[model samples]
Target: AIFEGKPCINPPHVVGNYPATPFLFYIPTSGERPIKWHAENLPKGLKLDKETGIIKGKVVEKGTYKVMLKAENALGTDTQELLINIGDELLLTPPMGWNSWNTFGRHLTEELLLQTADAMVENGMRDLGYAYINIDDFWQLPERGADGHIQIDKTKFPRGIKYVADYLHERGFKLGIYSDAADKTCGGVCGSYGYEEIDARDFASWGVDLLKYDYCNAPAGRVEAMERYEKMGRALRATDRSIVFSICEWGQREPWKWAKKVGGHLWRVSGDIGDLWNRGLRGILNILEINAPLSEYARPGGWNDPDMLVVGIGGKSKSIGYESEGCTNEQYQSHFALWCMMASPLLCGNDVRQMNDSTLQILLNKDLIAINQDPLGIQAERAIRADHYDVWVKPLSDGSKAIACLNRISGPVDVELNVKTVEGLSLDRVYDVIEGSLVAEASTGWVVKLAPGECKVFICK
Candidate 1:
């Protein structure tokens, strides 16, 4: 057992990109050093560096190609299928990653991010496609330079952001930075209002792969919001790098109505999510009520962001945690399933460095992740809603549907999922996605029991 084997190919089986965007894919592998790479039926305008296993170029065409990716050393070769769908789309799947806000707050440091990155790799999260190591707010000082460039926080990131980005990139991870559409960030730091181009160029220069552009202290009305967001969007496009734009306007202006037109990959749909089952605007059930009806607006390229996740926040955050009356693990699972069903970006706001087994179980569920990452890229609609119960259904590309049943009551209850009143939803077999158990052979009604603040996710085939 001590003797190791040959080359091991470990990159994701599927990948996608917008045709004209600069492509970057590091074929993560394991073997001896100097391992060579190979790609069969490689798409045009793209090249795979054998020495580094980094695929780079611009694909100007539109098509789906099955690229046979191989990693080889003198010992042997490992082969895997890599599906490259070069089309007019960016996030073919929802973005999944750990965000530094609910956990660290303003305590962000270079060591903190690198440690989280290491945890992501060692904890088997990266292998499951959680790639973005996003830093939210507090990365810069309160002022810009004379040239109006963002001044990197020397006290926090003494080595600069580019250094941290390089470390993440070398390990096959993308870095996300935060900015604002106003004069000051939510953390009272320098924001990019008149400095959109400068900040966009600075982000691209630092290898930042995504931007969380907040609307803190911005002017009123959707007109000003559109004009402001569009400026940054244009600036990002003009840059040489492909930086994913996230519009975090707190759904005040109803971004789903205009964010995609402004080049936003995802837009926040509600207030910050608190670690509570049900409380106020930030409660899980309250957020679901707001986000569930907006299914028709989301698609492959742009999605509705529901703010950062609170699955494992554990009542430790400042704003969100205090808003929490607290939640059970089952409630957390329900929150996770609801987010996946609605096709929201699954950005965890918990501290990954201290995640327990229960948290890991919820975070690392592959089947649930598959639903969120489903190529159809659509959200679920509430098929039925009651005073304390709701039936939400999402259609997948493979002709199956994910059905999430939620109990909004404080007491345990039984709910019936009947297709008679449900339009556009028919089921053959019902299977529980989270517990991985068969529910019933049903093209009819099925009764599911739920505890207080509990949810049951089932696959209807």
Candidate 2:
């Protein structure tokens, strides 16, 4: 904890914001008390409070502003560079990141997080815009500290959450912290509950860039859920950091209708996802059914999250939450394609440190990612439903569209897609997202050669 005493600034390396929007950024600095703050080369419209290190105001223009952040105490001073990417909108694209609940679950450790950070950067995910490295549940102690602050398990985070966040910040990645709205976390640890303000402050102190607030062990009723989520939402807004808030209430009360008003960048549209393609209540189809039709609510900053990706979990994940028999590569590919077309946040849940080639292929498909991250922010709709196939289409920003043809039968069936059904969807070029091949100008549509539970995605321009 040497850095905890000597002035060590651990602010976000990068933050995205909308032009002219209210901005609040808390600089997380670890050092002795009475630490003073100073920021040089501040943007035209923003100011930094020398006392609290909080930056507030609105920037009217769109550009990346580099700020020199400095923090000093009686001991020493630490400085770092901060980049505020003020653009048309924050999260103009859906959020892409990794979470622990699916693969490691309660078994997460500092080593696991550190390795994943390295893996993401070295494996090209970071380059492709996957930045958030999040710690899900089982991260805190069973009870709050004397000050009502959520306490990290020193055993798991040896140097503490701040240290881990510092590691990630140094590597061009952001850190996400998770908690629940009830009396206890899903992992049975102390939850935020009535201590929303203190808990939010605690996470901001640790330099968290996002908060995935869960809803478990709480009182029933949509009315109470709104109050709980709103309290935490407001609590996070009051903090100094520009943390992205996620509502993990499992769509029990249809947070989609009200989550954005309460400050949610994304809300879980269904319960936790299982690794299987179609089995049990949490299977892929069930979650999709609950989330896809609500495209009207999905926007540039707010999204309908269908839980994390199970692409590479393969049911080998220590967490159940699923049967041992995982989904096939075809199924996984289809799942990933559907997620992309539906405009869901791409929080990969599998262990990526040593993923197989198939998993990597499915995850690293740039074309699919492009659709999900399209600035249009339109969720694909079920445009056509036939006997054995369903076609989902999303209008993109470039006047083109992304399409998905899904096989709904229990077994393989040769289904020919009729391009005429997709009005105004034709183009001079149509690329098959999976095969990476171009369909001819005169092609009628698609022959979904893949078997049951498989899909073919196309980007027509």
Candidate 3:
């Protein structure tokens, strides 16, 4: 529609260059008639330009949305409606827990599992909400039973699967089982390939609460992969109980495109995260770059798992062949701090069975955990992406937010940022995310001197 002598711009058909997430749109319109705008089954945070006729705000949440918007003018009130969707669901911050893969692998035993469980409970993991005790690979017996049924290794799980699940459940925790997509798991055992349904039923009957479906040694071809995954997906859904389906296919089939459709709650994008600083940085940065693209796929019941945390995961005398692999205490804190800020799954890959006090402090930092478990469930995006330093900021549920700043290079580094780039946010407020304390912002722009390979994390209100 044209208006006046100069070129006139009608209200935007859809004003959305905004990042994915629940957003608020405030359109100010001046003139005689009030134009109305709405979404037919509009998304949450979907609002019309009350005075003007502008629709704004990102649909942070997920679900089907049909919106109807009406605009009123002297010519008559005009209404327009359209259907738009933000995404499937945004997962709240992930729960913190431990997995058996990092150190134990095939050596994992029922006694070991039980011991770890006890350690978790005694070491404050249970109290910290470290649910989902995942038995990664190699938890299965060497061969199928005479009935061709997968059986728990008696030598390993003498008490049996039910006992483990019962114990975890008794402590208000969930049990996680792992399997491969092919006939044999990567750890070399009968997997769920050709046996998806039977395995699904078996897992269900065993009272399993989560499934880590890996794609190792899976047959080539997308169709085959889908068939394999879908078969298990259908089986899981048949149980009628909501079990978090974790798809660990390593981003194949572009899980960001179809994990939810396949009934997955969290999908792995990166290979695996360790306590190594470079590994952590690489994973964090890669995920950050794809943050915007992954937004539509994030919501309750679904998430992006960038592998597990290796913060407290170093040991000189561990049984695992990888040897002790982790960073300094400061680096470990930074690792946990960065993951918390990213809203990624807080799976502890370290030996939680004997995690020390310093490690415990990093893991059990209530203030930090608060940000990860914020009600908003909004993953932070890059606030500033530059060569000197990169800063990512995520808004928190309590009108506060979390910020992770990294010194990209290894050396003495000084960073100067113009607050204007922070989504036009005012820099008047001081940020104290690193120490979980408040600080006063200096007038000469926020300047920080970071040592080589140093990072600063902040949780601010």
Candidate 4:
């Protein structure tokens, strides 16, 4: 017997942009000998393929457009309304936020999260676009409820998660929670393995705006990982709410290859980061090296995550079952600069409640943030690498480039970059992004002495 079901869209809603990377939307159909597709009110620059029930395009218009889509065959006809928001509707740039995992670990509490939210606003982080207050890992109990839904640990979150979500929403912040694809989370808590629909609905019911789906305690294969993650993605899209899905699979399967196809807004490109400069820095470098060749996959809605920012976490960070050392302020500066240049999500993992002056300076660099959030969504490429010094360049949306000269030496050293290194780059002057200063005119290139573990960034015109 041939099996067929009514045509239904996986993601009920669509969020895209003009000049977007080519996107394809498919509506599944069953029991049809040969289904025909037609769409009305499609946005400009997009077209529907009648043979495949797929709409594909790289739109140039920037606005929300409503389309009525229908698929019909000998059996029946199914129609649905699709809303596509073009340009910056769904993570047009790297997502900036605060996560509780690196800072508090399993010590999460409702009061702690509330105060952290307060600190975010009071410390001027909120105004700088740090909007997501994510509770990673400890928000749920060890087991699901009778209904197979994930349960909030009431002892810690006495007010329930929905209450906290509403509280954060009142302050113009979005709430993000974490879970695993297996039977148990990394912390031995309930996971979303066999209950993707239940957990997705539960999160949506609680007003969750983001879901960080981790891969731990799960089946051991790339195929299984994709299946589980895609299952959750489908469950999430089935809900009415629009939730940003973050896949935290530790890059084992090179998730950058297919994360967006599975409905992820961002996927981790490296292992978890720590507070220590050695271990954590290596993780960051691993992502930079690995994802360098994968930059073509990075786009406005989908991104490659390099994990959270351990910049200010320092000694306060606890991962898994251990505490790690913090890097010097300069190392932290280098870390932040590299992450921004790579277009990684700027999820501040430090306890914003007790941030230092240097931490504030590193985290609140508006110029660097703008580059990270550039409309083009291009990850910088390592242009010139010479032993302990390297130069990375990212062409921005505004006809300029973001450049960084990094020093990995133990002591101060002079790093030089010839303009010829970056083809077609002839700069008369450069703006120091970190210091907000304009440098004098340069003819051939730049030669600057940099402190150990420091990265100097600039916008060259």
State every prediction's TM-score relative to the real structure.
Answer: 0.89, 0.82, 0.74, 0.81
Rank order by TM-score, top first? 1, 2, 4, 3
What C-alpha lDDT does candidate 2 achieve relative to the native structure? 0.80
Instruction: Output the number of the TM-score-best candidate.
Output: 1
lDDT of 3 at 131: 63
Could you give candidate 2's per-residue lDDT for residues 141-243 as a string of tens digits? 9988887677899899988998888888766577998999987998899899999998888888888878999888987789999999999989987876668
Pick the winner on lDDT between candidates 2 and 3: 2
Cα lDDT of model 4 by residue, 206-276, tens digit = 98888999988887699999999999999988875668899998888989988998889999987777675
Clashes of each: 0, 3, 34, 6
**lDDT by residue for model 1 over 27-145, one digit each (tens)?**
65655555789998888898888876777778878889888988888788889888788765567778888898876788899999999989886675765668888999998999878
lDDT of 4 at 385: 74
Best by the lDDT measure = 1
Prediction 3 TM-score vs. true: 0.74
Local accuracy by lDDT, each model: 0.82, 0.80, 0.63, 0.77
Higher-lDDT candidate among 3 and 4? 4
Q: List the residue pairs that clash in candidate 1.
A: none
Query: How accurate locally is residue 434 in candidate 3, as Cα lDDT from 0 to 100?
Result: 54
